[PDB]
Structures are given as structure tokens and as C-alpha cells.
């Protein structure tokens, strides 16, 4: 599986995941200083406030 894992709107830069691995992410929120997508191989555990979106595809989370 083969992942994006570039911020936001940046030129796009892929991750290969660990063997077994079948999940993407896309992960968004706010702070002060605006908002913030970040993305990444897996499908990380739920926190407060955070907006996640997982898939389970090649490069399937820009």
C-alpha cells in the first residue's frame, strides 16, 4: 500500500506503509494559524475534534 502523505494543498509526496498495512488517511483540523490536512499511511484512532477519513486503497487519501 502506497500512500499520499503530503499537508494540505503542497506538491504531492507518497509513503510506502509497512507490510500489511491496507489504510490511508486524511486527517484535518484547526489551530490559530488556519487549517491543516495531514495525511499518512493507516487509519489512526479518533480524537477529540479531529475530522479523520480513512480509505483503503493506493493513494486513494489526497
Given at each position: 500500500?502506497?500512500?499520499?502523505?503530503?499537508?494540505?494543498?503542497?506538491?504531492?509526496?507518497?509513503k510506502?506503509?509497512?507490510?500489511?498495512?491496507?489504510?490511508?488517511?486524511?486527517?484535518?483540523?484547526?489551530?490559530?494559524?488556519?487549517?491543516?490536512?495531514?495525511?499518512?499511511?493507516?487509519?489512526?484512532?479518533?480524537?477529540?475534534?479531529?475530522?479523520?477519513?480513512?480509505?483503503?486503497?493506493?493513494?486513494?487519501?489526497?
Amino acid at each position: 500500500r502506497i500512500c499520499f502523505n503530503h499537508q494540505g494543498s503542497q506538491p504531492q509526496t507518497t509513503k510506502t506503509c509497512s507490510p500489511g498495512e491496507s489504510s490511508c488517511y486524511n486527517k484535518q483540523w484547526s489551530d490559530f494559524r488556519g487549517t491543516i490536512i495531514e495525511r499518512g499511511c493507516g487509519c489512526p484512532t479518533v480524537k477529540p475534534g479531529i475530522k479523520l477519513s480513512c480509505c483503503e486503497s493506493e493513494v486513494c487519501n489526497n
